[PDB]
């Protein structure tokens, strides 16, 4: 059975319990913490690409009001994010299972941009998700996994200084 797990879930949980925030810029900002996934149960000899996208966790605009995050009252449908291809893709099961798959080069933007960058809506809450795509072989297959622990709000600057401090303490 294909097992997918979160490396350093203990650090992600420190961020989650304060409500995590991720900076988004015109040119795109890398994530801290970095999403790292432990994968076991692949065919060492089979071929896979690792994809990353962000699901809008709810249909609301959020705002930092008197030191607390609160959702707007007027939901809109959230068009899903674009997919980031892990640069080691495509690659052998063995490649993927030898060390945690780390998405350190994905950059989060707020502007439609050349590409590589993933555009998110500022002040929307997002749940990171991966697709492990079996490629090259005859029987194409996809396995998807969400990481609730890694939820954040996309912000142009940090609102909760407790987040600012955790980010600096552990980078």
Q: Which residues bind ligand NXS (CB under 6 A)?
A: 49, 85, 89-90, 133, 135
Do the Cβ atoms of 86 and 80 come closer than 8 Å? no
Minimum gap (Å) between residue 84 Cβ and ligand NXS: 11
Q: Which is nearer to ligand NXS, 11 or 85 (CB)?
A: 85
Breaks (C-N over 2.5 A) in the chain follow: none
Distance (Å) of CA 112 to CA 27, 107, 108, 170: 10, 12, 11, 30
Q: Where are the beta strands (DSSP E) in 32-160?
A: 36-40, 47-56, 62-65, 68-71, 84-85, 91-92, 101-102, 107-109, 118-119, 125-135, 141-146, 152-155
Q: Which is nearer to ligand NXS, 57 or 85 (CB)?
A: 85
Ramachandran sector of residue 153 (left: φ over 0; alpha: ψ -120 to 50; beta: rest)? beta
Q: Which is nearer to ligand NXS, 57 or 83 (CB)?
A: 83
Do the Cβ atoms of 37 and 88 come closer than 8 Å? no
What is the rounded CA–CA span in Å between residue 55 and residue 154?
Answer: 12
Minimum gap (Å) between residue 91 Cβ and ligand NXS: 8
Q: Which is nearer to ligand NXS, 107 or 167 (CB)?
A: 107
Q: Which is nearer to ligand NXS, 49 or 150 (CB)?
A: 49
Minimum gap (Å) between residue 49 Cβ and ligand NXS: 3
Minimum gap (Å) between residue 140 Cβ and ligand NXS: 7
Minimum gap (Å) between residue 53 Cβ and ligand NXS: 12
């Amino acid at each position: 059975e294909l097992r997918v797990g979160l490396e350093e879930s203990e650090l992600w949980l420190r961020f989650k319990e304060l409500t995590n925030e991720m900076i988004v810029t015109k040119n795109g900002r890398r994530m801290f913490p970095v999403l790292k996934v432990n994968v076991s149960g692949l065919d060492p000899n089979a071929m896979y690409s690792f994809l990353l996208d962000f699901v809008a966790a709810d249909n609301h605009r959020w705002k930092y009001v008197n030191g607390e995050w609160v959702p707007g009252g007027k939901p809109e449908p959230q068009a899903p994010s674009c997919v980031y291809i892990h640069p080691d893709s495509p690659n052998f099961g063995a490649h993927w299972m030898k060390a945690p798959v780390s998405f350190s080069k994905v950059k989060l933007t707020n502007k439609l941009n050349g590409g590589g960058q993933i555009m998110l809506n500022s002040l929307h809450k997002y749940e990171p998700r991966i697709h492990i795509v079996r490629v090259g072989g005859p029987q194409r297959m996809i396995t998807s996994h969400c990481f609730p622990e890694t939820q954040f709000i996309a912000v142009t600057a940090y609102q909760n200084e407790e987040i600012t401090a955790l980010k600096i303490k552990y980078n």
